[PDB]
Design an enzyme around this catalytic site. Structure first.
Site, PDB file in Angstrom:
ATOM      1  N   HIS A 190       0.816  -1.153   0.096  1.00 23.39           N
ATOM      2  CA  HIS A 190      -0.031  -0.062  -0.078  1.00 23.39           C
ATOM      3  C   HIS A 190       0.963   1.292   0.033  1.00 23.39           C
ATOM      4  O   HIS A 190       2.104   1.179   0.263  1.00 23.39           O
ATOM      5  CB  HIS A 190      -0.824  -0.019   1.197  1.00 23.39           C
ATOM      6  CG  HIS A 190      -0.396   0.457   2.623  1.00 23.39           C
ATOM      7  ND1 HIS A 190      -1.147   1.157   3.561  1.00 23.39           N
ATOM      8  CD2 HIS A 190       0.716   0.230   3.106  1.00 23.39           C
ATOM      9  CE1 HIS A 190      -0.584   1.321   4.437  1.00 23.39           C
ATOM     10  NE2 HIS A 190       0.760   0.640   4.312  1.00 23.39           N
ATOM     11  N   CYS A 194       3.615   5.526   5.392  1.00 21.78           N
ATOM     12  CA  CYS A 194       3.697   3.863   6.236  1.00 21.78           C
ATOM     13  C   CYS A 194       5.176   3.843   6.202  1.00 21.78           C
ATOM     14  O   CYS A 194       5.711   3.781   5.251  1.00 21.78           O
ATOM     15  CB  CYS A 194       2.955   3.133   5.792  1.00 21.78           C
ATOM     16  SG  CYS A 194       2.928   1.616   6.530  1.00 21.78           S
ATOM     17  N   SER A 234      -5.813   5.429   9.604  1.00 22.84           N
ATOM     18  CA  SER A 234      -4.610   6.095   9.210  1.00 22.84           C
ATOM     19  C   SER A 234      -4.678   7.214   8.414  1.00 22.84           C
ATOM     20  O   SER A 234      -3.680   8.082   8.330  1.00 22.84           O
ATOM     21  CB  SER A 234      -3.649   4.876   8.946  1.00 22.84           C
ATOM     22  OG  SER A 234      -3.998   3.667   9.406  1.00 22.84           O
ATOM     23  N   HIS A 293      -5.387   5.361   1.613  1.00 23.12           N
ATOM     24  CA  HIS A 293      -4.611   4.179   0.831  1.00 23.12           C
ATOM     25  C   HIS A 293      -4.748   3.942  -0.665  1.00 23.12           C
ATOM     26  O   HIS A 293      -5.816   3.882  -1.020  1.00 23.12           O
ATOM     27  CB  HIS A 293      -4.533   2.642   1.969  1.00 23.12           C
ATOM     28  CG  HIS A 293      -4.803   2.868   3.138  1.00 23.12           C
ATOM     29  ND1 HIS A 293      -3.585   2.656   4.098  1.00 23.12           N
ATOM     30  CD2 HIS A 293      -5.579   3.305   4.057  1.00 23.12           C
ATOM     31  CE1 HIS A 293      -3.798   2.793   5.151  1.00 23.12           C
ATOM     32  NE2 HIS A 293      -5.203   3.141   5.356  1.00 23.12           N
ATOM     33  N   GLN A 340      -7.245  -2.726   9.966  1.00 24.45           N
ATOM     34  CA  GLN A 340      -8.459  -1.926   9.949  1.00 24.45           C
ATOM     35  C   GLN A 340      -9.368  -2.349   8.883  1.00 24.45           C
ATOM     36  O   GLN A 340      -9.093  -2.585   7.758  1.00 24.45           O
ATOM     37  CB  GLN A 340      -8.209  -0.433   9.770  1.00 24.45           C
ATOM     38  CG  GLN A 340      -6.674  -0.070  10.472  1.00 24.45           C
ATOM     39  CD  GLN A 340      -6.540   1.476  10.414  1.00 24.45           C
ATOM     40  OE1 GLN A 340      -7.411   2.289  10.980  1.00 24.45           O
ATOM     41  NE2 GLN A 340      -5.495   1.793   9.716  1.00 24.45           N
TER      42      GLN A 340
END
Ligand SMILES: C[C@H](O)c1nc2ccccc2[nH]1
EC number: 5.2.1.8
Length: 147
Positions: A43, A97, A138, A141, A115
């Protein structure tokens, strides 16, 4: 009768039908082709000021808005789809990330570990397919299912 999550739509600008997946936010012109214990995904994460942790290896204080994060995501998707850039390259350079250092690779995972919007999109992707923007706590993505 389309694979999990796919629906027909009409282009506003062209009038041609296209296909949209409401789990992955993928969209494409062609009719989709068509679950495992585990999938493997990479991702690219773009965080924003409302991210659960508005901080990353790229930026001690992530200050961009959700809308700004989504526009960055949209531009990365455009360059991936045009071939101008590779997913792995953009992930390594711009993902918020820590998996950026592994070209976005997260390794394999089961249901229940990630998640939920991420998990659902990962498992609805076919092997080799890429998501549209997927929203979690977060950030936003781009998900590439590799296995
Ligand atoms: C060769 C590759 O497919 C590719 N796609 C591009 C899109 C925009 C600019 C340069 C590009 N190079």
């Amino acid at each position: 009768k389309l694979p999990p999550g796919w629906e027909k739509a009409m282009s506003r600008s062209s009038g041609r039908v296209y296909y949209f997946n409401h789990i992955t936010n993928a969209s494409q012109w062609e009719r989709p082709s068509g679950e495992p214990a585990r999938v493997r995904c990479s991702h690219l994460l773009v965080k924003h000021s409302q991210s659960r942790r508005p901080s990353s290896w790229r930026q001690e204080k992530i200050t961009r808005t959700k809308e700004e994060a989504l526009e960055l995501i949209n531009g990365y998707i455009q360059k991936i789809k045009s071939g101008e850039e590779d997913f792995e390259s953009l992930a390594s350079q711009f993902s918020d990330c820590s998996s950026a250092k592994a070209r976005g690779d997260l390794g394999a995972f089961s249901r229940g570990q990630m998640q939920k919007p991420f998990e659902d999109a990962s498992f609805a992707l076919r092997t080799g397919e890429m998501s549209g923007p997927v929203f979690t706590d977060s950030g936003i993505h781009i998900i590439l299912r590799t296995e």
